[PDB]
Amino acid sequence: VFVLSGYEYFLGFLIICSLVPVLALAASALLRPGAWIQFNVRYYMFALVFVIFDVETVFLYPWAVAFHQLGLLAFIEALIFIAILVVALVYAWRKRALEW
Template structure:
């Protein structure tokens, strides 16, 4: 069997899968008009789309991004830490220390208080 036959077979299976999912969604979807329900949840909006957010949401988002970036940098580090040795361990602790300074600062500024 040629490699292209396998690729074309996979594309055909995927196309039938997508078509099948589309047909199933047409059958089980609600058949009423969706003018009053613009969101995927089907519920009407509770507030205006241009309403303002409290600043605490931005602070929580920035803290989340800090921890997210920590994980992005720790995965490749975990792969090479055995080869690089002690220097990689020291660099990671410096990196984690800098992140903890940011977390302590956010904590002292009240970013985690919801009252």
Template structure:
């Protein structure tokens, strides 16, 4: 019985040793020289100019929100499509998915009626 725990303990010790060794090797091989250029703020390859405050139009947040809604929709649709053909999942899962898609369609219709989906 104890030999099973010995194998687990050996794997844990080897794993932790490898982790500590990797961090130590990284620290030993890293060359760091703090220069003024390295200490400046860096954002997407653009030098910082002016204030750090910029306002974004609310439209971009709405597009991000719509993307999240449809990404979640896709996350639910693909697993549903894989189990739909299995025995016992046919009619009930079809009705549940149409209810789910109806909620998503109502949300899309609401966004369309509010003019969120137009760029102008």
């Protein structure tokens, strides 16, 4: 059974927008005639702070949608999650993590 509504057009639009590059690059195919990067650990360090904060955003999306049907006790409990991960953010500035 598939009780999701609105996804009938998602499978068709996934194919047609995928046919935008593969057919246009084929429509153009019939009309046309001391190597070092330095190991600087900031590309990793900017991406680690993303993963810790791309997960925080995911955890707050059930809270934000189902907020005004939960109440105040689910706001005190959801404030502990934000206030702790603010200390993760102050730790990243102070320890020169996201300095670049």
